[PDB]
Amino acid sequence: LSELPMPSPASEEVGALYDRFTALGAASLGENLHFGYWDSPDSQVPLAEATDRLTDMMAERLRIGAGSRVLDLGCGVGTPGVRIARLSGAHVTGISVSHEQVVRANALAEEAGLADRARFQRADAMDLPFEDESFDAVIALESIIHMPDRAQVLAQVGRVLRPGGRLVLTDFFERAPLAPEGRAAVQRYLHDFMMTMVSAEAYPPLLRGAGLWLEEFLDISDQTLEKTFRLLSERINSSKVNQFDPGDLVGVKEFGYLLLVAQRPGKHH
Amino acid sequence: LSELPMPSPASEEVGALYDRFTALGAASLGENLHFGYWDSPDSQVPLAEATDRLTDMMAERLRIGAGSRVLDLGCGVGTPGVRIARLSGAHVTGISVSHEQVVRANALAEEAGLADRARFQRADAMDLPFEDESFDAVIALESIIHMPDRAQVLAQVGRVLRPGGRLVLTDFFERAPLAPEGRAAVQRYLHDFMMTMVSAEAYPPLLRGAGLWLEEFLDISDQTLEKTFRLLSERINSSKVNQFDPGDLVGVKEFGYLLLVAQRPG
Known part of the structure; x- marks a missing residue:
């Protein structure tokens, strides 16, 4: 259960934490703002290739193709969004609440020669400025974590999803009650980057x-x-800006990262 | 969650129902008592290979091999238990509450040459007659739907599973509240086969x-x-028991079949 507390992260305030960070060192030009995926804990694929592997894993669950309309909910500096449009030929509308993020993702699309296939836009998943049933698929890649109310976001997704459309997302969750030594580092994370964390049975x-x-x-x-x-x-x-420590989390084994796929009943074109 | 009436099945009464099923041939040697799995709605792969398809997909999730000890938690006439022993080289121990099923399952093991690697015995998953940390993996293939209490059944599996071992089960569930028309068919189905049903959020x-x-x-x-x-x-x-169509169930989109995998920590 959610014993170790939660910040209540704010939309146009998470866009300040990352108008600061997806800029100046946490993310400049072509970076995935998400975990890597490795076939075995001893695989030594570089990080960059494992980050795109998580992207590719999730894009296949969208079940999309050229002419598909994909909504990119929380788009970072745009690396997964323009990847999906380039490899699949689908059309991608991504939204971010940070201005620097929109600017950088639109630059990535343009550098790719795809400024019209992948378009990025200032918008808030709490209130989606898109008409009902405008999307074939929605991907939220490491992004619902930063959002204030999962219930509202999910209702927005379900309104804009066409029937038979699919939502694929990642999220933090509690695999089992946390060891006490670990909860210090799990709330230092959740709080210093304005994240919450749900229970597995919360999602159905x-x-x-x-x-x-x-x-x-x-x-x-x-x-x-x-x-x-x-x-x-x-x-x-190995580089002599703050003290965010990942390791304190290494091994807090009850901390959990989940891939989820939901579907809106009906069927598609 | 709490709309349809469900029986609460008793082990020995389910054993008696299925003894009668088995003893007619309704479940005959080498038959699977579970759904087919098909990758697309129109593929015409026949029922038998689709049924083995589900077995193989669940067996690979066990992550087992030659010399794994596998608990076939509710085994039927033995067909998927012996198939797993034949194709993977593991040691399958299966159980049923049905005496006639246990007989057919040992019969199937004997005809395949695997009576030493696929064993079956009458037992109840509420009270597993097995040591702690005895099994590398448990599989419960459409079996828990007939069992009396899921929490206790899961406690037993947890106790006999070894650290790092996996449970693979299927199960019935409610995808979304059932339209009135639907629950007509579903209620008599749960009733007539001594089965129940859960909710996706129930399991974690x-x-x-x-x-x-x-x-x-x-x-x-x-x-x-x-x-x-x-x-x-x-x-x-084709049969022209006031038995059932299973067809009154087609088009009840809200009745659901789930595959689930859980682990015991290393």
């Missing part, structure tokens, strides 16, 4: 509230968390 | 209670229910 009724049926819940904690936290702390400490 | 606490972490939840309704129910009614139409 959340999703049902928004018109979606859970299709897939997949714990990918053992393929994502540790190796990324290692590779990042080895970066930060 | 149930699993936890038993010391098990949820690893995979998968709605496989659209690959299993409709095509299976339809082929079954078309050949029960």
